[PDB]
């Protein structure tokens, strides 16, 4: 309702919407690659999943550049923030396209993989935690504004190690947390417990992405060639 808050919300909702196609807009398609048998790693699934992740990293960087004040931080701190939040944002995005009935997740080109295929594509031991998080996310009934704000709050975090200006990042995050709080109450006034519940997802996300950093390690051993360039930059 405040003029400054409304503009911040509009900017972040627009940033998310313009870098994230919704499940409803996409034409779902399946693949037969080890859809029924669990394996350590399906090579054809890995190549598709690694390429889709590369494209999604590019979109996350485009999203970050549209968040107010992000491009005003040092290049060193933008890089530190993007690398620290990389897996958190990709995981929140893949989990936003969850279909409970078929237990599938849909990627940005429409590729829809079941629990077994997500496991075989490279998730492995991460799979049940990612799918549990998707199920916890679903009842929250979040819209573009809230998903976008959750992504911006996860990226713009002062607690990341090796930040040249952590207090500057802390200051930049505060207007986003305030904007999320008022928007959640304005959109859903009957349930005032939703705001700290949404923030709990960020803690779960950090926990899943900490395990995810260990999965990058075990995957580098299993995959034939080296990791794609951009993925190596973000996670190594």
């Amino acid at each position: 309702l405040t003029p400054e808050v409304g503009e911040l919300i509009e900017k972040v909702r627009k940033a998310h919407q313009e870098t994230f196609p919704a499940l409803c807009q996409l034409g779902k398609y399946t693949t037969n690659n080890s859809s029924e048998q669990r394996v350590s790693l399906d090579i054809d699934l890995w190549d598709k999943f690694s390429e889709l992740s590369t494209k999604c990293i590019i979109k996350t960087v485009e999203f970050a550049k549209q968040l107010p004040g992000f491009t005003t931080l040092t290049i060193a701190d933008q890089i530190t923030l993007l690398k620290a939040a990389c897996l958190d944002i990709l995981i929140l995005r893949i989990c936003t396209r969850y279909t409970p009935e078929q237990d599938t997740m849909t990627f940005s080109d429409g590729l829809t993989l079941n629990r077994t295929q997500m496991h075989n594509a490279g998730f492995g031991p991460l799979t049940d935690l990612v799918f549990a998080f998707a199920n916890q996310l679903l009842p929250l009934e979040m819209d573009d504004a809230e998903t976008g704000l959750l992504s911006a709050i996860c990226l713009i975090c002062g607690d990341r190690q090796d930040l040249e200006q952590p207090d500057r990042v802390d200051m930049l995050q505060e207007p986003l947390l305030e904007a999320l709080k008022v928007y959640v109450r304005k959109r859903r006034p009957s349930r005032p417990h939703m705001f700290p519940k949404m923030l709990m997802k960020i803690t779960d996300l950090r926990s899943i992405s900490a395990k995810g950093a260990e999965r990058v390690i075990t995957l580098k051993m299993e995959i034939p060639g080296s990791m794609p360039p951009l993925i190596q930059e973000m996670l190594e």
Binding site: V61, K65, Q78, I79, L230, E233
Partner: peptide, 10 residues
Amino acid sequence: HKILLRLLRX
């Protein structure tokens, strides 16, 4: 950091 940068630098 390459990529990144690129990216960035914008």
